[PDB]
Every structure is written in C-alpha cells, then in structure tokens.
Write a protein that binds this ligand. Structure first.
Ligand SMILES: Nc1ncnc2c1ncn2[C@@H]1O[C@H](COP(=O)(O)OP(=O)(O)OP(=O)(O)O)[C@@H](O)[C@H]1O
Ligand SMILES: *C(=O)CCCC[C@@H]1SC[C@@H]2NC(=O)N[C@@H]21
Ligand SMILES: [Mg+2]
Lengths: 229, 673, 246
C-alpha cells in the first residue's frame, strides 16, 4: 500500500448542511493501510471511535468523533473510553491520529450528576499528557472546550489540519457568521498548520509520521501524576 | 474535428450523468464553450467539473431541477447560450420545450416538433408507417375501448395477444395474454394502470411475435433532405423490457436484409421529414421478416457501438446538422469496421428479479481504461453516491475488435478488471451472459434471460477445474497473508525467530463442502494440492491492490479480494462472481468441530429508538417489504437529523412514529416482522 | 515636563481600587469579597507581591506570590465582576506565567475562581487560553500541589481547570460549577432546573463527587484554606511536613 495514495472519495463525504451527519468509520477506512481497522469497544459509547490501524506499515492508534451517534457529542462513557485508549497508546510509543467533529459535551442533569466534569477532564489530561507523535484532522466542527480536548492549541497535536468544510466556533450561531464560517480565523492565528484537500489526507499523515518518529520532549520529574479520576 | 468550420459558440447541455459528459467531451473537441445545468446534489458531479461554467437549477428531485423548464430558460438567458442539447430523456421529447426555445431565440439540437409529435403516439406512428409502405407489426388499427372489441379483433389477428399502452414507454404498460378471459382481465387492468400512471388510457391490441429479435437502425438526416442509415445494432438481452447488452453488427442479419432494413428506415425518415439523428427499431422473426416497432426521436443510449464500427461521432454530426451544414458522408461511405459490444453496468442487485435498484456511496471506483480496445462512458467518480432520484446506471462499457470473438474476449477481460466498491452492481450477470454458449453461438431472443435462468440469476456455476483453481488461489492468498504477517522490522533487543514451516495444511469450506488443501511456498510460486490435484500459482502477491493477477497452470486469472477476516472468512470475486470461502488450519478445523452452532435469531424483535426525537417525515410507506440496513424514517434531535434503518429485518407493517410524533429513546418506531 | 509620575499613581489607584465604588459595593451586597480582599485574607499580612500590574490597562485577574505561615505560595484570583468584558489573552497569559514561575521554583498554586461578572460573550483566543492553562495544569500534576477555590459561578471549559487540580473547594450558595447553563438544558433536554440544583456546592459535594469540601462564606473558606495548606508539602521533591508536637 503506497503511502502517497490519493483518497478522492473523501472529497465530498462531509455534507454541506451541518444538520446532516456522516460516518467517520468510512473516513478511517479510506485513510488507513488496506482499509483495515481493529476497533476497540465497537458496541459501547458509539459516539466516539477508538482503534488500531497501520500507516505505512507502522501501528497507529485512532480516535475520532462519530456524528451519527448523539451528533458526535462527548459524554462520560465516551470520555473514559477514549481516555484509557489514549493513555495506553502513549504508554507504549504508539502514534495517535485524531479526527475531530465534536460540537460540544452532552447537556443535561444526568451528565452533571454523574460527574461529567471529572470524566471530561480525564480525556483532557489523556490528550495533554501524551508525548508520542500526534496528528489531528478537523473534518467539520470543533466547539467550546471540546475543541481544546480533541488535540487543539498546543496541549495536543504536533500537526493540525482542517478540511475546507471544517470550522471552529466558540459559540456557533450575518456579518459575524461569515467571518467564522471557515477555518481562516484559526489559520491566521496559527491554530492549524494548513488547510488541506481531503484527497491528500492520508499522504500528509504518512509524511508527518515519518518526521515525528524521532520526537522527544522533556518534562519535570515526578513519581507519578494525579489522574483526575 | 476541423476547427475552421465555424459552429455555435456556446452550447448548454440540459442533462446529467454520462451523456452530459459525452456531449461536453465532443464539444470540447470542437472548441465550443459548454454550460452545464445541475441540481444541488449534483454540484460536485463530473460533468459539472468538466464544463466551462455551471448553473444550479433546483433541488434534488428531477421534477424540480431537470424538468423545471423556466429555470433552464432563465439559465440560458443569463448565460447567452446559442444552442441547447437535451441528450436523451428528460426534456428531449417535450414539445413545449422545443417550442419555447425556437420561439425566443434558441436553436434546438434535435428533430423538429412535427416529427416528434408524429412519432410520439404509437397509433399515429403505426398508421404513418403503414402509409410509409414499410412492413408493420400486424394488428388492428385504432383505439380499443372495451375488452369485447379486443377479443373480436383478436379472433382473426392470432391467439397471441399483446395489450399495449399508447405513447409513453420505458417498458411499462405492456402485457401479454393468451386466453379470452386473459384478454378481458389484461385489458381491464392495463386500462386501470394507464389511468393511474400514464393518464392517456389509450390501449391497442397487437399480434405477439414469438422469439423476437430486436434490431435497431441508426438513421442520420440533415435539413436538406439527405438521409443515411448507419448499419444496425442488436439489443436482445433485456429484462423488464429494458436493454442491458447491445451488439453493433448483427450476426443474425446478412448484407441483403441489412440493406433492405436501412432503405426502409431511410424511407420512413424521409416520410416523417426527420432532420437529425434517430433510430428505427424492428422485430425480426426466425424467418428473417422484420416488422416496424417504434422510432426514437433522440440519441440512443447504445449509440457508441455504431460509432465504433463506423468511426463517426454522432453528436458532432448532430451539431453540424443543427447548424445548417449538409451531411459530409454518402451512403457508400458507410461501412462496417470490426465488431463492437456494449454492456450497461447498473447499480442493481442481479440476484433479485434480474436487477433491483440499489443505493449507496462509492468507496472505490476504477475503470479498466488501460486494457486494449475498451471505451468507458460514465459520469461516475470515486465518492459519487447513487441516490433514488435518478437512474441507477453506473456506466456503459464498450469493446471493439476485429471480429465477434476478439470483442467478447476483450469485454470479458475488461469486466474482470473493473473495480466498484460501495454499491451492488450487475457485473456478474453481464459476464455470465457474454460467456454463455448460446450468446457466443448467436441464437438469442428477447426471452434470453427468461429461459436461460427460469428460476432467476444464481451466479456462475463453476466446473471442477474452475473450482480447483479457485481453491488454489484462495489457499495461496491465505498463506501469503500469513507469511506477510511475520515480516517485522529488526528490533535488536528481541530478535524475531521466523518459523520455518514448509507445508500448510488447510481446511477450506466452500458452499457446503469441505476440502483439504496442502500448500507449499517456493519464492513467488505456490504448489497447491487440492484433493490430490496438483496446481501451480504464481503472482507478485501484492496484497494491497484491489486487483490481483495470478497464473494457475499457465492460465491467467484476475481475482479481487473484497473482504478478509481473522476468523477465516474471505470473499473472492472470481470470473465475475463473488464466492465466500472459510479457510482454517487442520488443527483449527479439528477444534472447530467441537464448537456449538449458535442460532442467529438475535434479540430485540421490537426496535429500540437510539435517541429521543420527533420525526419530520417517513420515507417509506407501511406495507413495503424491507430488510435491515434500509432507512425508514428521519428522526431529529439536538438539531441533527438521522435517517436510521429498520431495527429488525421484516416488512414494514405500520409506521408508529409518523410526522410530529416525539418518540422517546428505546421505544417502538415501526411495526416490523 | 512629563506627567508619567502622576499617570503611574493614577493607574495604581485605578487597579487597586477600581474605577469606582459601584460594582465593588454591588459585590459586597451579594455577600462576596473582591479578588484583592480575598488575596489579602488568604496570605500573610504584608507578604503579597503582585506581578503584571499593567497589561492592557484590569485583566479581571490578580496574580502574584505570597507567604502562608512563612511558606511560599503562588496565587491567582479572578475578578470578572464589572472589571473585564471577555476573558482575553492577557488573563490566560498572566495565569500561565504565574504557574510557570511556580513550577520553576517548586511552590504550590492556589486559584480563586470567580468568573461570574461577565462570562465570555465573545472570544476565540479564550479557548486557546484555557488550552494553555490545561496544558500547564497537566504538566504540573504530581510536581507541585494545585488548589482551586470556587467563589463564584464558573461555566464552560473553564470548569475543567479546577477538575485537573488536586483539591477543589466550593463556597455554599454563591459558587456554581457546570459545563452548560440551565437555559440550554431546558432548550435541549426539556427539563426545569436552577443553577443551585444544576451545579451548586451541595450538588458537587454530595452527588457528583467533583468538589471536596464546602464552606459557609468567603472568610470561613479562606481560613480553612490556610489551615489545609499547612498540611501539604511545597513540592514533590520535599518530604512530608513535620511540625512541632506536644
Ligand atoms: N409486438 C411485440 N411482440 C413482441 N415483443 C414485443 C412487441 N412489442 C414490444 N415487445 C418487446 O418490448 C420491448 C420494448 O418495446 P418498445 O420499444 O415498444 O417499448 P418502450 O418502453 O416504448 O421503449 P423505449 O424505452 O425504447 O422507448 C421490445 O424490445 C420487445 O422485447
Ligand atoms: C439547541 O437548542 C442549541 C443548544 C445546543 C448546543 C449544541 S448541543 C450541546 C453542545 N453543547 C454546547 O454548548 N453546543 C453544543
Ligand atoms: Mg423502444
């Protein structure tokens, strides 16, 4: 499987209407080697997707939002499911690839009483702690603190890319919408490295995984950290 | 393609799909600016991309986008298009469109409104043909109002009776009848369905012809009275009265009959004052007696094959005729060059009623453009989706050769090298048809699919040698995957000790039988022992490419590995048909013998709503048989709408969640079996 | 002849005492103190040393260092009550720099969160600032102790910073912790709930398990915070504190 293979089928996979959803597993299958994906917890917390795949023959971990289920919103179960997988991938030098289409956290008194703050902070910590190479692609949406948790603004994401249909809005929704109906406000402030065509996605990621294989960072000494569990 | 001959400057193609792409291509070859009309869902289609400029015309439904005549006229006015090309279908047969275009300022690339009106109605066409001294299908002239008139006129014409609905078409509103009670009941129900759908309610009685051969003649005429016949075409392999396989030179016909049919078609075209490209269709019996049947006043879908054997670009000639130039070819210039065969690759399931429309999005699409003597006409690209609004036709595949055998061989090779992943297609049916013994011999009729597969399409019934080759290929692929699984990079801390296995003993389950296979690897060559039969399989064993070319005992075979699981399941497209094979090791099979079979009735007979939300509308109607994976209704929650499928496989008895029903999570939605 | 000398004094008096007495009185009638009053109560008398007194005229946050019972600590206190419109980049930059200094020297961080006055109402660099704060909280986890005292309503991604800290304390009847407001809950979930029910101190100290303790008011909370801080070591490089015993 050549690392420079184009994926034109991803050029129109994201619908123009934000009210209409799509399947992130299709994108994951299109990007990875031989379209082979080992999904972890496929039938639990279906609003998030985690699994193992290969890029250029190297094992990679995949985390992504699923707009089909609960509009891709994050909650307690998806938070912990993604967090432990990210921690395992970081603990064994496995690079992470993230696909971001999260509109925020699931509201309601059940989530608040269940401790949505702690469980969300678990995913925040898991992404902010990883020292492995990490590549992030924003497909359509990234709102609120959900934008920050899914590897955005320097606590996670060595390279960040946005599709032409991607957009970041702190409070989504005439003159103001046109300004923030595009990732240009993100690009001008250096939020994302570039705006790429979907067809090049795989190739880009492969190139990045070659450069970041020798990434080393230094952190202050500690016996261990305090997980927000 | 001489550019010195001045032609129109701007042409607007009022169509979509592959015909729009073909028209845009032939206009680009002629140095003409092109305007493409499109709907919202087609804003990223291929013909929009290859056009000079594009205009959005309306929403997804065809009644509001490709039939909204006011919108097309507004687009023409705002783009100042000199000419308009309707392709086939849509508004190509609408008198009002041509009348308005000729009224305002627009020239219409097609037949005049007089010819379209003359040949629009079947009764008028038949009477005009009878007045045009051409052989016609024998029957009673006039409109039948009651079934008793039908039976009395069926007394003398013959026992085989056909009930036909005037005008319209598309293989609908037409039926057969044998008995007199059959005559009444068929006439009554045909009148009912014509009132329901057609609305004309005009029915006619015809003498059915057994084992008919559908032969078309492509006529081309200018406005100066010249008329030419461009050989013939054979379109006999049909289901639902719709053609799938077409053949340019008629093997059944000879020179004299072809010349007579061409002369009759030219005479009919002159009588109707045709001034464009059209086709006249005939039914030929066993004794070579052709009878007229319908005239298409537009470009046929299967026109490329007669282009291949004649070397003429039909759309270019149509444009030149519409400009006013005379025909640049004489009847003696027309000649037969080689042989041509075309198949219609549809997005349909051939195992159900010889084709049932299917929907989906194309994850992978690769045409065999690098093969010798192959031409593909498609408006389809990777990522395109097959919606319900338009025809589920993926592509048209044409192959040409020096003779019939070379063309058929090249067509089989092209069909075996055609990658379509995302929807279900009918490539298996086409490949089965083109390699059939009867099709090769040439004794075919319109009931070919009816009698070759009386119980329906079942697949490719593979022989013993083919079964051995398939088993050897599957075993070799399994062993190649296992061997690739052992190729890690050097660790330098814990070196990998590669196992030195020499023989792989495998149990391969195919259909319902179990075979014992012994595989050995010698570099790039696999020696395979299947039930005592020895075969050699060689290939590059590239496990990532969609197409794999292998050589089994010197025979070259192209196979596709559609799916593969760690449990041993594997789907292989071989000779055009998809086979499921389960491959295990001998120890694995022996231990699997102890596994208990689990009944797969599943749970949750009542479907549970995944999220609470109201239903804007219901796509399907209660009483329709559906299965799991087919969308039923659209439920909106958190300002996002999901068109979820049926929870359990069963017919939709009743949609409990109608419009305005705010159904909660985990609740009954649709009564299913 | 330059008026810089009087301009500096005017800016100092504007930062320390605010533009006017209006909203400080308004805070007083709600039973809450100001950021500077809270800092003065928390730290030893005369030990506070402020940093970045002059950043885009304000900042709705007061950061600095001080001593508790003679031991060094770094503190920040939010002052969003009619003192800042949006939680701008200056806010997060000051918090990040004070946390960086605390990590550099090896001293704990205490944060008083009272982002009530103006929540955001506009900001794109705001999420960036909280992303930086989250990164520095995760970096300091297990290196220096981190204490959060919520003394007012906190909403949005901000609430994730106290969650990453080691200990979280709340003030009864005046502090709230919730990702999404009650009005959005009504709009989406279609249920009636108040701020106290959704994210009050009792909810987060009895049901959700988010906060660790609750206190009666600001003075009691700060006294108990000093008492609790007496227990902890300054860094993970230090042994457990040993006091004299009787
Ligand atoms: N009189 C007949 N005897 C036998 N078969 C017939 C007769 N009339 C029609 N058929 C069958 O019906 C098929 C289609 O006929 P016809 O061209 O009239 O239909 P249509 O739906 O109007 O066509 P189109 O879509 O090309 O306009 C023929 O190919 C043939 O198989
Ligand atoms: C609908 O009434 C508008 C509010 C929903 C906003 C969406 S859904 C929940 C997520 N949380 C948030 O702040 N935005 C997202
Ligand atoms: Mg016809």
């Amino acid at each position: 499987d050549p690392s420079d293979r184009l994926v034109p089928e991803l050029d129109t996979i994201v619908p123009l209407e934000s009210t209409k959803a799509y399947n992130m597993v299709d994108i994951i299958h299109s990007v990875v080697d031989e379209r082979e994906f080992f999904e972890i917890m496929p039938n639990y917390a279906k609003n998030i997707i985690v699994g193992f795949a290969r890029m250029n023959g190297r094992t990679v971990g995949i985390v992504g939002n699923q707009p089909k289920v609960a509009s891709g919103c994050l909650d307690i179960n998806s938070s912990v499911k993604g967090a432990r997988f990210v921690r395992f991938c970081d603990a064994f030098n496995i690079p992470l690839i993230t696909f971001v289409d999260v509109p925020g956290f699931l509201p309601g008194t059940a989530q608040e009483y269940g401790g949505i703050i702690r469980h969300g902070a678990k995913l925040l910590y898991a992404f902010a702690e990883a020292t492995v190479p990490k590549v992030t692609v924003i497909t359509r949406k990234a709102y609120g603190g959900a934008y920050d948790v899914m590897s955005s603004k320097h606590l996670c994401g060595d390279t960040n890319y946005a599709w032409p249909t991607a957009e970041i809005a702190v409070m989504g929704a005439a003159e103001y919408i046109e300004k923030f109906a595009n990732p240009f406000p993100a690009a001008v402030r250096g939020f994302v490295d570039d705006i790429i065509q979907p067809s090049s996605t795989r190739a880009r990621i492969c190139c990045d995984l070659d450069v970041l294989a020798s990434k080393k960072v230094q952190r202050p000494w500690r016996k261990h950290a305090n997980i927000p569990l | 393609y001489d550019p010195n001959e001045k032609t129109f400057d701007k042409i607007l193609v009022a169509n979509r799909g592959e015909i729009a792409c073909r028209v845009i291509r032939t206009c680009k070859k002629m140095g003409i600016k092109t305007v493409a009309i499109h709907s919202d869902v087609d804003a990223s289609s291929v013909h929009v991309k290859m056009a000079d400029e594009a205009v959005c015309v309306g929403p997804a439904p065809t009644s509001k986008s490709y039939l909204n005549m006011d919108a097309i006229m507004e687009a023409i006015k705002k783009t100042r298009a000199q000419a308009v090309h309707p392709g086939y279908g849509f508004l190509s047969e609408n008198k009002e469109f041509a009348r308005c275009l000729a009224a305002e300022d627009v020239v219409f690339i097609g037949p005049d409104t007089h010819a379209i009106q003359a040949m629009g109605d079947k009764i008028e066409s038949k009477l005009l043909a009878k007045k045009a001294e051409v052989n016609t299908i024998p029957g009673f002239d006039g409109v039948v109002k009651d079934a008793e008139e039908a039976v009395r006129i069926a007394r003398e014409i013959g026992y085989p009776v056909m009930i036909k609905a005037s005008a319209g078409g598309g293989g609908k509103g037409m039926r057969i009848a044998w008995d007199d009670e059959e005559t009444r009941d068929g006439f009554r129900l045909s009148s009912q369905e014509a009132a329901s759908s057609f609305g004309d309610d005009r029915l006619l009685i015809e003498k059915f012809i057994d084992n008919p051969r559908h032969i078309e003649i492509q006529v081309l005429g200018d406005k100066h009275g010249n008329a030419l016949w461009l050989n013939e075409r054979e379109c006999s392999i049909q289901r639902r009265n719709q053609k799938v396989v077409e053949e340019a030179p008629s093997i059944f016909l000879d020179a004299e009959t072809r010349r007579a049919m061409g002369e009759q078609a030219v005479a009919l075209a002159r009588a109707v004052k045709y001034s464009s490209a059209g086709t006249v269709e005939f039914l030929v019996d066993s004794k070579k007696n052709f009878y007229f049947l319908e005239m298409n006043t537009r470009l046929q879908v299967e026109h490329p094959v007669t282009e291949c054997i004649t070397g003429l670009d039909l759309v270019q000639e149509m444009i030149r005729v519409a400009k006013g130039y005379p025909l640049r070819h004489k009847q003696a210039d027309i000649r037969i060059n080689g042989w041509a065969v075309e198949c219609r690759v549809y997005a349909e399931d051939p195992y159900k009623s010889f084709g049932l429309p299917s929907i989906g999005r194309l994850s992978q699409y690769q045409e065999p453009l690098h093969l010798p003597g192959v031409r593909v006409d498609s408006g389809i690209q990777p990522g395109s989706d097959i919606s319900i609004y338009y025809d589920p036709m993926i592509s048209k595949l044409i192959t040409y050769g020096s003779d019939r055998t070379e063309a058929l061989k090249r067509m089989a090779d092209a069909l075996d090298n055609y990658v379509i992943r995302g929807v279900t297609h009918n490539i298996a049916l086409l490949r089965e048809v083109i390699i059939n013994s009867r099709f090769v011999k040439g004794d075919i009729s319109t009931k070919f699919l009816s009698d070759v597969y009386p119980d329906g399409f079942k697949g490719h019934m593979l022989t013993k040698s083919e079964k051995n080759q398939l088993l050897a290929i599957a075993s070799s692929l399994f062993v190649a995957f296992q061997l690739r699984a052992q190729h890690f990079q050097e660790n330098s801390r814990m070196p990998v000790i590669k196992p030195d296995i020499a023989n792989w003993e495998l149990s391969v389950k195919l259909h319902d039988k179990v075979h014992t296979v012994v595989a050995s690897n010698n570099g790039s060559v696999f020696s395979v022992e299947v039930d005592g039969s020895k075969l050699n399989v060689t290939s590059t064993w590239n496990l990532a490419s969609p197409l794999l070319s292998v050589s089994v005992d010197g025979t070259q075979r192209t196979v596709q590995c559609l799916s593969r699981e760690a449990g041993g399941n594997m789907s292989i497209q071989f000779l055009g048909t998809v086979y499921k094979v389960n491959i295990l090791t001998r120890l694995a099979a022996e231990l699997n013998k102890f596994m208990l079979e689990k009944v797969t009735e599943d749970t949750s007979s009542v479907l549970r709503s995944p999220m609470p939300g109201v239903v804007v509308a219901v796509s399907v109607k209660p009483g329709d048989a559906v299965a799991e994976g087919q969308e039923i209704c659209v439920i909106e929650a958190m300002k996002m709408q999901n068109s979820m499928t049926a929870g359990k496989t069963g017919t939709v008895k009743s949609v409990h969640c109608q419009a305005g029903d705010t159904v909660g999570e985990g609740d009954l939605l649709v009564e299913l079996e | 002849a330059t008026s810089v000398n009087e301009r500096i004094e005017n800016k100092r008096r504007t930062a320390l005492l605010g533009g006017g007495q209006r909203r400080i009185d308004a805070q007083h009638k709600r039973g809450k103190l100001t950021a500077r009053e809270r800092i003065s109560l928390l730290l030893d008398p005369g030990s506070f040393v402020e940093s970045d007194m002059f950043v885009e005229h304000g900042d709705s946050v007061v950061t600095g260092r001080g001593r508790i019972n003679g031991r060094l600590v770094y503190v920040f206190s939010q002052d969003f009550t009619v003192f800042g419109r949006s939680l701008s980049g200056a806010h997060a930059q000051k918090i990040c720099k004070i946390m960086d200094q605390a990590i550099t020297v090896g001293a704990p961080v205490i944060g008083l969160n009272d982002s009530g006055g103006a929540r955001i109402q506009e900001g794109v660099e705001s999420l960036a600032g909280y992303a930086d704060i989250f990164l520095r909280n995760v970096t300091a986890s297990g290196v220096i102790p981190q204490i959060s005292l919520i003394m007012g309503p906190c909403a949005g991604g901000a609430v994730y910073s106290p969650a990453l800290t080691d200990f979280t304390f709340m003030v009864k009847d005046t502090s709230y912790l919730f990702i999404t407001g009650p009005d959005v809950v009504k709009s989406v979930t279609n249920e009636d709930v108040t701020q106290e029910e959704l994210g009050g101190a009792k909810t987060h100290t009895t049901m959700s398990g988010v906060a660790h303790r609750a206190f009666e008011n600001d003075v009691d909370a700060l006294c108990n915070l000093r008492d609790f801080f007496n227990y902890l070591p300054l860094s993970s490089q230090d042994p457990a504190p040993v006091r004299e015993c009787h």
